[PDB]
């Protein structure tokens, strides 16, 4: 995770009324505004998620890693979203059981060859059971500071 752009305004708590399409469109807004991705970035993330899901049934907290083709990204970035209660995502492994996701790591990766690096970083982050449990209670700045340290 080298040169990944991440700010305090890339962290959000989404309300309890949201669907997955609302989550994707919410998490893309701060990226689209800064000019990190194209204007219709949300659409392509929604389209890909249907065909190729990004749900990871990890205990205790389910995790989503929604993204799209790298041609739609300009400058590398990541947007974190916390959910009030579980939202159902399809399993990325191809199991029929759903994934109750609470933490969403929206990836906007411009280089395809460093996708596996960002994924490996996420897997290491979501392995830390203590940190993941704290993400559910920490506020926007507390989450930024915790994650920003993990990137550096």
């Amino acid at each position, epitope marked *: 995770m080298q040169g990944i752009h991440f700010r305090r305004h890339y962290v959000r708590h989404l309300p309890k009324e949201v669907s997955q399409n609302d989550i994707i469109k919410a998490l893309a807004s701060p990226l689209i505004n800064d000019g990190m991705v194209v204007s219709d970035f949300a659409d392509h993330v929604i389209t890909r998620e249907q065909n190729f899901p990004t749900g990871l049934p990890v205990e205790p907290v389910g995790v989503a890693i929604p993204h799209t083709d790298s041609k739609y990204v300009r400058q590398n970035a990541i947007s974190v979203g916390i959910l009030a209660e579980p939202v159902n995502f399809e399993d990325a*492994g191809g199991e029929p059981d759903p994934v109750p996701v609470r933490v969403v790591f929206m990836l906007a990766l411009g*280089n395809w*060859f460093d996708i*596996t*690096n960002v*994924l*490996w*970083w996420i897997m290491d982050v979501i392995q830390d059971e203590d940190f993941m449990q704290q993400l559910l209670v920490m506020n926007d700045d507390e989450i930024y500071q915790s994650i920003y340290t993990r990137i550096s």
Partner: antibody
Amino acid sequence: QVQLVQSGAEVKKPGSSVKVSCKASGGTFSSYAISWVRQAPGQGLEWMGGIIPIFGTANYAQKFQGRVTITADKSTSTAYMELSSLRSEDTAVYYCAREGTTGWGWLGKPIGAFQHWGQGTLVTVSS
Amino acid sequence: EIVLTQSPGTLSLSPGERATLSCRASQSVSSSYLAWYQQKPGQAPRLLIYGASSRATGIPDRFSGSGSGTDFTLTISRLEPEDFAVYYCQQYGSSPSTFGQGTKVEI
């Protein structure tokens, strides 16, 4: 330590299509990028495309976009490359290549550069 | 697309000497996305360097990479007869990944 066992050689007629397979072993399959690189008989290396199997879609080079199809079977740890509308130009040795890991054995992050290679699949196009 | 021009085209050296290979890029590639390969006849490429400077696992300290932006260089310090082969440079900072034409190191 990773093995990439490719399929046998193919003798194809012009206009037909070929499906070459790459069987991965010795490490995790879904969490790493598998690329396909070509080399004409007395020529240099040429990146066709690649796929990260946990995620869905393949990445393609613009020259091959339209007649190359790269897929990955999670349930058999086998990556495939299908090249359609075979021209005489397409006569080459086709390699599947998997990125390395920054560390000994199975340990560490991915490096991107292709540390592991298949034996090579020779495809010849002639009527 | 980014074109990688290698230099020299062919290089004949006696064993024990230092070989200096170059890889010129059409555009600036960040140092973290350039690799070097060795390929003997009738074999697959072998990864030497990956981080422009960083060594692949099991590769000796005889091989060393360096450079930034447009100019990159592979340096073989002490040439053994096993080292005489074709050497390629690769960019994977953006799609699609492109290779050099190759520098043949001869005896």
